Amino acid sequence: TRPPLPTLDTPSWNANSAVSSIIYETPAPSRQPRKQHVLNCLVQNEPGVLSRVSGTLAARGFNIDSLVVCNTEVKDLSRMTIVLQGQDGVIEQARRQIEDLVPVYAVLDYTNSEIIKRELVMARISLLGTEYFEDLLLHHHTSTNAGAADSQELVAEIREKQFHPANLPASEVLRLKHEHLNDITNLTNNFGGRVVDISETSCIVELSAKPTRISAFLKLVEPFGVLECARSGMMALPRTPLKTSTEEAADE
Amino acid sequence: ATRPPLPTLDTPSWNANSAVSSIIYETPAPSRQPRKQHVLNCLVQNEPGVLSRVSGTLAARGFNIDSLVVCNTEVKDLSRMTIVLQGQDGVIEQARRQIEDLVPVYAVLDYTNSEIIKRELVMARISLLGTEYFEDLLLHHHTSTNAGAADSQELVAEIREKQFHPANLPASEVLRLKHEHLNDITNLTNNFGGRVVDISETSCIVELSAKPTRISAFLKLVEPFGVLECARSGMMALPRTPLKTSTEEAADEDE
Amino acid sequence: RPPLPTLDTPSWNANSAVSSIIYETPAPSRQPRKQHVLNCLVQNEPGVLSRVSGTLAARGFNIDSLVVCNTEVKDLSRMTIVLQGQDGVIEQARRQIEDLVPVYAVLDYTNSEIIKRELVMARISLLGTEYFEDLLLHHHTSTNAGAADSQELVAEIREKQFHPANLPASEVLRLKHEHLNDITNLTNNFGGRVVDISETSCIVELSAKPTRISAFLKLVEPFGVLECARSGMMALPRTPLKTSTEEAADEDE
Amino acid sequence: RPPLPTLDTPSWNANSAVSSIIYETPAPSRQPRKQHVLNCLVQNEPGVLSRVSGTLAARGFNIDSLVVCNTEVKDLSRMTIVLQGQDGVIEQARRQIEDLVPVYAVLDYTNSEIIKRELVMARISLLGTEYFEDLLLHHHTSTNAGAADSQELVAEIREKQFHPANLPASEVLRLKHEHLNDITNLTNNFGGRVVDISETSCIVELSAKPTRISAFLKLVEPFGVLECARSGMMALPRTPLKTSTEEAAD
Amino acid sequence: TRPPLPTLDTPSWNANSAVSSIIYETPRKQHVLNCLVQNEPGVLSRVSGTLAARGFNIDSLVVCNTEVKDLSRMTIVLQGQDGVIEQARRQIEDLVPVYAVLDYTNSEIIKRELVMARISLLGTEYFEDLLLHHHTGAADSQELVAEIREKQFHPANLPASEVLRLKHEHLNDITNLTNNFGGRVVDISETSCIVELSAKPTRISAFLKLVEPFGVLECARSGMMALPRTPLKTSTEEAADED
Amino acid sequence: DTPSWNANSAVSSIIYETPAPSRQPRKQHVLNCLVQNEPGVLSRVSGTLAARGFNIDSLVVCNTEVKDLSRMTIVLQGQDGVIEQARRQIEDLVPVYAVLDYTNSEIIKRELVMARISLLGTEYFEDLLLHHHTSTQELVAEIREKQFHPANLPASEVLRLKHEHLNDITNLTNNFGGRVVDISETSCIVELSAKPTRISAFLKLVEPFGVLECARSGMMALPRTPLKTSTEEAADE
Amino acid sequence: TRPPLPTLDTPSWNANSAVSSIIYETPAPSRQPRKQHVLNCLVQNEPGVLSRVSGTLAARGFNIDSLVVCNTEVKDLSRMTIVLQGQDGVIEQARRQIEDLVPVYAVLDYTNSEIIKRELVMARISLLGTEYFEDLLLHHHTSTNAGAADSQELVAEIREKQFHPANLPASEVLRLKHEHLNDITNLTNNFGGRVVDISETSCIVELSAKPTRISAFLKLVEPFGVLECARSGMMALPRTPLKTSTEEAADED
Ligand SMILES: Nc1ncnc2c1ncn2[C@@H]1O[C@H](COP(=O)(O)OP(=O)(O)OP(=O)(O)O)[C@@H](O)[C@H]1O
Ligand SMILES: Nc1ncnc2c1ncn2[C@@H]1O[C@H](COP(=O)(O)OP(=O)(O)OP(=O)(O)O)[C@@H](O)[C@H]1O
Ligand SMILES: Nc1ncnc2c1ncn2[C@@H]1O[C@H](COP(=O)(O)OP(=O)(O)OP(=O)(O)O)[C@@H](O)[C@H]1O
Ligand SMILES: Nc1ncnc2c1ncn2[C@@H]1O[C@H](COP(=O)(O)OP(=O)(O)OP(=O)(O)O)[C@@H](O)[C@H]1O
Ligand SMILES: Nc1ncnc2c1ncn2[C@@H]1O[C@H](COP(=O)(O)OP(=O)(O)OP(=O)(O)O)[C@@H](O)[C@H]1O
Ligand SMILES: Nc1ncnc2c1ncn2[C@@H]1O[C@H](COP(=O)(O)OP(=O)(O)OP(=O)(O)O)[C@@H](O)[C@H]1O
Ligand SMILES: Nc1ncnc2c1ncn2[C@@H]1O[C@H](COP(=O)(O)OP(=O)(O)OP(=O)(O)O)[C@@H](O)[C@H]1O
Ligand SMILES: [Mg+2]
Ligand SMILES: [Mg+2]
Ligand SMILES: [Mg+2]
């Protein structure tokens, strides 16, 4: 009798089921027109400049997603990155505005340009698991106005869970703590971030990426439990797009 | 007082006989595969209809082509095609002379019996929910073709009542198993020199570029986790020159 | 025997070594006051950034940085503020903002351990520093009326030894990648990252405390900073973790 | 369709969020006080260490650390002393040290931007908290009394769920490397490294500032620190580089 | 009414029990020769044959090519007193095909040794069961394997989902272990893996003792190679001259 | 202005660079003996091969951490009928369990090289190699007259060249999966373990810097496992 | 025609010349004896206990090389690693002499035992090259022989050398700074150290290793010009030399 080991027996697709899988899982409707426009305002640093442009955009019917003032290491000069939605006619109007303001130099449009979008996020994440996160969340809500009465029936359920620290040994909760810490660390690493702080029950992460990616990280790291988050607005700096000599000289 | 006890493992040791008995037993088999596959490299002038003309010729003569990929060099009106064939030297050489005679081609080189760098690209979406879920997910799409219901209930109920199926696991343990599987796959693709380009709630996408014999081994190791979606290229190559030391090349004993 | 010149590295004397350490001393930072940090917990409503910034502008508050950060909580934001002044002035500034309807509370991070950080993106030329000295003058000539002294100095610059107009194509190429390498290793020592590489420039990315950011830009300055963009300042509080043996501070009683 | 249970993790609201953030605010600053760092440049004469340490001991000075270290210069030594007290007392200490004739001068790196470094080497168990809790009790009853006391402690620590004696050797083997990986991640993150790996323990080294080096030992404390060896603090002044657009306020 | 979090309750040493543990936990030299030999036909059997005829207790003998035409260097490791090793050195040096044999014992050298090992990714129970099979005496051993295949964490007593997770857990443990040492993982299979390590003989032997519980299926240790390094010390240490 | 390849000139360069068959139809035969560690087993395995005229390239006795058991990875050339003959000769020896044939198996070949490489440039190495050559003549002044020779450079240079060379050697060593284990004032020692042909490539690339000492040893072998997917495993018949 | 190349082939060794170099470069066995001894004192923290032990070693003429007080994470317990050279007879006398002290528990002898030796060094290294370093050195060497400025002729030949920054364009001294910096960085990376500070002129390296590697490293960075240096005494923490199941089976009687 040779040393026995159970065959896992991994099932394999056929051409039919494989197609139906790709067909079904592929985002066929995709999304509605999401396209956002970005602007780069070059303003002069005067005692009252931020309130002007930010207030001017508010004076009109403009929806502003983000607006950040960036110092450019030049005396009395600031670069402002504005993110807004709408259509080309409305955006150009907003771009034609602000530029007319005298403390500004120019308002460039990077919407149809190849740029580098970068936000900065810093978040403290719990290492005590999901059960503790529900416990902590319900606690800061049941203090006042969590309905029309108490929530002790809900609290008792969360603390009745299997993987709640109150039901686990000190050695087991320690390993799950470092297991979670590593899981967060590996997510942060793949996204190209850092772990700048490690405490007894939490850790602080730091990540710089485009809004598309920097929010995808927050979704993947959400189940661990975000205790405190801070996400900056979008910074923009146009890169220099390069194409090979063969693909270049496309004079036609 | 006694010292804190420890259950001694005492890992058993080999002896001279059982060790040799193990090595001999674990021996594979020589020449389990026939003659090594042949790799051809076409230098084709980039004019409209070349892909249909070349590939159409091989199909019109019944040549067992394993893979054919056209690569765009950084030269105007010049493309490179890498073809993989099977068969005797006499049949494959004829295939070379048949393609090279075509008008829009410059020359068809034979890369077999030559030191080359074979490369291939694969991108695969891998499930993080585990083995049990993959059995459920795959069998679910099979019922869209099998047109069976009452008979398949014996299978799906058997699967969903397994221990490590997500339905039977708490939400906190499924989360850990997702990242445990993720860390396993990530460590697995890193050893192969690959990347993890996408991470989701339920799956991840790995990217790897290596020789076919390397990728197939990779896709076999990742297979138990459950490959939801795969894209594997043909095969391209670039000739290598085997360097030898001045002492080794000085051995010109051609007497 | 095959000869090689002894470089003969001289050693310090006990007095000469002490003399240098003292001469290179000090660079003291006995500042009149630190940089006070405030953190406003703010409800999201139309024209709320104009309110906080406007209130600080209406009064004689010398603020340095004001950046609004978004939490993953619906209708909730953070405003990390950095300003100058004394304890009495800024505490009054804290109560000024806190009385505003949209805000919930304004915390003070001045006397607390926080993680100061700001993002910075810079475009740096890979060509010589003399090329940057030429490019600098060219855009200034496009500002100040008339060339005049421009043609007198541009001749002095363009005749320097390591100007890309006085070197073969292979030399400048090897100089661009050498400059590129020197920059990449600078942004590697710092927690940075090179995100773009052009034919005559490159873009670096760095996120750290304003101390390192200011230090980093000072180091890449000689190469020639074409563009720059520094964030305000973000902050997250951290609690100083002390050992169990260091609970003797509790035994101090 | 496959089941797959949901992970409806609760979301913060405006009220509960600001309530938690406010709750996590300190006093702040009740204890202790600011530390002073001094740097002595002394002649390497026989008995200098006895002079300086003896001087600070004879006086009413509470020194935290004192580190002698060579400087690759003949008969020249450098010492880094960490003080405790008001600025007046510290300066009084500095002058009394400098007044000694084997020392050239004594610098004050307190208000200066310096690089603080301290070395640590600790052997950390891999058998978990239960075994470490057992290990301490065995060595404590070997110095306290020869009687068979604390019977309901050794019996309580043992027969615990994750004590090695209650696990198969397979799990203990994995737990060793599981703990090892956790510790290794701490060291790699803190900028340290593992220099030794035994069957039931490992030795890690770490060179960082005193504040950072203490936070590390607190994180690796629950794993069980068998031996430890924290160096004293070394200090070297750096050259701070503010940007070129600072100009002047007045 | 705040979320319950059980304290670790981690105990701490006192001054007495600490030093008590330190006291309790407180506890021949090899000779290395390097022969410079002209690569004559059948010279390995000439040197090794000499060491056997004279009755020496040599540990290793690895022949290395110096990348020079008709020149090889042999690193020989042997134990014994300083007197008997000099005899072994002189005995070899007298051989015609050898140039000179150097004594690398009293010198700071870089001792190296290559090891390739195949380690099972399955549990230690499977390894304990696998050895019994190849050792198989099938009469009384039928009861022994019963005590083995009964144990949990044996692949036969676990779902394939967990076994798969155990394979990679052990794999990551071996990988993290071989990464601390100057090693690497070369081959990964669905049952085992192959590691490669090169360091001083003490490190290899230490590494194999650590990877031992996982169950080493197949191993291969090279002889000890040696290459002398020159110890560098500072100028103030170089100036420390005594008459 | 950087020039570009022509559609025709590109093809010409490819076929011109494409190497002629620089290898025999025969291949690298690898035999792995499983021997009993008896006194004098090494001398008789070698003796049997040497007395019958077999072109062996290496031997390498390897311990297997099993009591009184060793294994030898023998590499030789010749026809299949000759190698099989050489195999049967060794296996017939009574302290030999079996001699496995790896000449047609997926194996992992490993040589281990340690070499001290000079950092003082090609000029100094050319001088040093000529100095030690004179044993058992106007070139010594011709070499020491060349540019970039240490004696013809300032003290600030050479130091800057030594580390430049050090960086080059390190980058070569890193790419091949090796490491620099020692850094002398005028040289450095590298350590590399890989395929014998990969070692030969490394010792050729690092050759111009000057190889002071070298130790290549021999090749070790351990069988790999050809894993293929479930759709390539179902490619039977 | 054909594309030319400057050289044909690199020269090779022969069996006679190869063994000639190996025998010649093989180190002379001078330091066969003369080993150092490592002691570890488990001491109770009494007021002025350091000056008590160090005073004992000095008063009895013991040749100690380093004495470092390490703090354990235990109340009132500190260990001291004493490194001293001498013969076995004298060292044991030193050990027994120290151990006889009241505040010490016991003194262990880590000599002939597998321990982890570790020193910590922080050094400031110039990036301006060799010429500038012997200029800066001679500058603070003016403490002696300042009569009639006799150092002028010694200074003159220094500042008139090719790669002295005063004779180089500022564009080249920049690349020379970073080239030197990368030579130091790739050097300290090899030893397991790290560069923690980079400035306009110099940089600070940090390396923790056994005293042998520390000294070897300082000998390699010495030519670049070490401005400041600080290396602590070694710390000692014994390890456990493991050996395989067939290695430990050397139970021969
Ligand atoms: N679910 C995700 N959403 C967004 N980003 C992800 C996700 N998963 C991983 N990433 C990050 O995306 C990175 C891969 O992007 P990559 O480096 O290849 O740039 P890219 O090819 O230009 O992609 P894109 O064209 O979308 O910008 C991963 O290394 C990882 O850091
Ligand atoms: N089961 C496997 N089959 C094939 N390749 C594997 C397998 N497991 C791992 N690999 C990959 O092979 C790599 C090792 O290949 P290696 O670096 O030795 O190339 P090599 O020296 O040229 O040898 P070979 O000629 O066999 O490819 C591993 O790092 C890993 O990335
Ligand atoms: N000239 C410089 N000025 C400021 N920071 C620098 C300079 N050069 C390098 N750095 C950065 O300082 C970092 C070292 O700081 P470290 O990681 O040791 O934190 P630290 O021990 O708390 O010291 P600090 O108080 O200065 O922050 C380097 O990794 C490097 O990125
Ligand atoms: N000149 C360049 N052109 C294109 N890509 C570059 C260039 N220089 C660097 N890169 C690559 O871009 C990478 C950084 O972009 P990354 O993909 O990581 O973020 P991203 O925001 O997703 O980029 P993008 O939005 O342009 O797709 C670099 O790591 C580098 O590999
Ligand atoms: N709980 C902790 N306490 C102290 N340091 C930690 C802690 N957790 C992590 N670290 C370390 O802090 C480091 C991050 O600090 P960093 O290198 O950025 O210096 P910094 O920007 O000057 O901040 P700081 O002033 O706190 O030193 C991480 O490398 C991390 O290893
Ligand atoms: N139990 C062990 N036995 C031997 N070597 C180990 C062990 N554990 C780890 N190692 C390896 O030893 C390495 C540390 O070696 P190190 O750099 O300190 O050399 P060293 O300073 O000369 O000290 P030593 O004399 O002990 O070799 C670890 O990085 C690790 O790779
Ligand atoms: N000239 C040198 N002197 C001392 N150490 C050096 C020198 N050059 C490099 N090193 C460092 O020594 C390291 C090699 O140490 P290694 O890992 O081989 O430990 P080891 O096997 O115990 O060697 P040893 O017995 O000599 O201590 C190099 O990686 C490098 O970091
Ligand atoms: Mg810091
Ligand atoms: Mg070592
Ligand atoms: Mg390969």
Side-chain angles (χ1 to χ4, degrees), chain E residues 115-118 208 216-221, chain F residues 63-65 71:
Chain E
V115 52
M116 294 193 300
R118 190 192 313 271
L208 292 176
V216 42
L217 302 175
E218 186 178 8
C219 180
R221 290 186 66 173
Chain F
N63 306 126
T64 180
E65 291 310 288
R71 57 193 307 174

Side-chain angles (χ1 to χ4, degrees), chain G residues 120-134:
Chain G
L120 177 62
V121 58
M122 293 187 299
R124 193 192 316 275
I125 313 174
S126 176
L127 306 172
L128 282 179
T130 312
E131 286 82 2
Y132 180 88
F133 181 65
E134 54 183 352

Side-chain angles (χ1 to χ4, degrees), chain B residues 231-243 245-250:
Chain B
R232 183 179 181 179
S233 68
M235 202 222 76
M236 43 187 299
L238 206 67
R240 188 203 297 264
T241 55
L243 264 63
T245 323
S246 57
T247 310
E248 305 178 40
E249 68 177 13

Side-chain angles (χ1 to χ4, degrees), chain D residues 104-131:
Chain D
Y104 297 88
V106 183
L107 300 178
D108 199 343
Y109 288 167
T110 304
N111 305 125
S112 307
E113 293 83 357
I114 67 179
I115 302 178
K116 301 175 295 182
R117 281 304 185 268
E118 173 178 343
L119 228 178
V120 66
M121 297 190 54
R123 183 177 300 102
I124 314 156
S125 180
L126 303 176
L127 291 172
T129 308
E130 287 80 4
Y131 183 84

